[PDB]
Paper text:
The pathway in Gram-negative bacteria employs the prolipoprotein diacylglyceryl transferase, Lgt, to dagylate the pre-prolipoprotein, LspA to cleave off the signal peptide from the proliprotein and the apolipoprotein N-acyltransferase, Lnt, to perform a final N-acylation step. LspA is essential in Gram-negative bacteria, it has no mammalian equivalents and its active site is accessible to potential drugs at the outer surface of the inner membrane. The enzyme consists of four transmembrane helices (H1-H4) with the catalytic dyad aspartates, Asp118 and Asp136, towards the membrane’s outer surface. Extending away from the catalytic dyad and to one side of the bundle of transmembrane helices is the β-cradle, a hemi-cylindrically shaped sheet that sits on the membrane.
Globomycin, a 19-member cyclic depsipeptide that includes five amino acids (g.Ser, g.Thr, g.Gly, g.Leu g.Ile; the g refers to globomycin) and an α-methyl-β-hydroxy nonanoate, inhibits LspA by lodging the β-hydroxyl of its g.Ser between the catalytic aspartates. An extracellular loop (EL) between strand 2 (S2) in the β-cradle and H2 sits above the substrate binding pocket in which resides globomycin. Looking into the binding pocket from the membrane plane, globomycin binds with its g.Ser hydroxyl lodged between the catalytic dyad aspartates and with the rest of the depsipeptide ring bound to the right side of the pocket neatly tucked in under a retracted EL. In the globomycin complex, the loop includes a half-turn helix from which extends conserved Trp57. In the case of globomycin, the g.Ile and g.Leu apolar side chains and the nonanoate acyl chain extend from the bottom of the ring. The latter wraps around the membrane embedded portion of H2 below the apolar surface of the EL. Differences were noted at the C-terminus that was fully formed as an extended helix in the myxovirescin complex but was disordered, and without useful electron density in the globomycin complex.
Author numbering:
A (entry chain B): 1 to 4
B (entry chain A): 0 to 154
Write the structure that this text describes.
């Protein structure tokens, strides 16, 4: 979900 | 004073406003700056540092965009199902799920189109070496804070  | 089963009107335009501002801000940084450039917003505490994220923190992986692809979709479907089954008559959680849904979709568009994620928020408020993030990351984190507060019931 998050950028990484 | 509206008490509805599903606050679909409020939930969607929350997701709409978050995705719009995440995609717009991401795009403004992409077209006004170069990778590595940085300009100040609040001196010594907030900079706009142009960065791109492709999961390089995890090291060598055969295909991670496909795995991120499968992960994001599975969770996007579960959020909708969570919204329907256990978020009835609960505007607070429906807002939180929307923040989680919008924050996941915003990054999802970046990876599907470009295979990367635009990161531009660079602060020293949470200590340093905290990675450069964006609005989609912010909505997700806030949505997690809200459900943790919603999970802190019965205790
Ligand atoms: C000025 C800040 C405005 C504060 C707004 C929301 C606080 C929540 C901020 C949460 C930051 C999320 C960090 C994150 O998720 O970063 C992971 C990603 O991989 C990075 O590359
Ligand atoms: C120009 C329009 C840009 C983005 C619209 C898409 C923004 C997201 C709209 C769909 C979000 C959504 O469906 O949220 C589900 C909700 O939490 C439970 O019904
Ligand atoms: C740059 C990123 C900043 C993002 C700021 C706000 C995003 C969403 C803010 C919420 C938008 C309004 C939602 C709302 O309050 O509408 C419900 C109302 O009660 C209808 O009946
Ligand atoms: C917490 C507050 C930060 C949240 C969003 C910042 C939105 C940033 C919007 C994009 C600004 C880009 C810009 O202004 O670029 C300056 C100049 O043109 C470059 O040389
Ligand atoms: C700091 C930057 C943004 C703070 C955003 C914090 C978002 C918290 C809003 C509170 C909320 O969404 O709850 C609505 C309530 O449940 C309706 O009945
Ligand atoms: C720079 C990073 C920070 C900015 C990016 C943050 C992402 C958006 C998060 C929250 C939007 C605001 C929360 C939505 C407002 C809730 C409105 C609502 O729930 O309705 C109010 C109702 O009147 C009560 O009964
Ligand atoms: Zn009432």
């Amino acid at each position: 979900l998050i950028s990484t | 004073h509206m008490h509805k089963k599903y606050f679909i009107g409020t939930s969607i335009l929350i997701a709409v406003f978050v995705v719009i501002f995440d995609q717009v801000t991401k795009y403004i940084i992409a077209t006004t700056m170069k990778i590595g450039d940085s300009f100040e917003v609040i001196p010594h505490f907030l900079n706009i540092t142009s960065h791109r994220n492709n999961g390089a923190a995890w090291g060598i992986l055969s295909g991670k965009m496909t795995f991120f692809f499968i992960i994001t979709i599975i969770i996007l479907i579960a959020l909708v199902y969570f919204f329907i089954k256990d978020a009835q008559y609960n505007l607070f959680m429906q807002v939180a799920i929307s923040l989680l849904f919008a924050g996941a979709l915003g990054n999802f568009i970046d990876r599907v189109l470009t295979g990367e994620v635009v990161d531009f928020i660079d602060t020293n408020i949470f200590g340093y070496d905290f990675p450069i993030f964006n609005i989609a990351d912010s909505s997700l984190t806030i949505g997690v804070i809200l459900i943790i507060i919603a999970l802190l019931k019965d205790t």
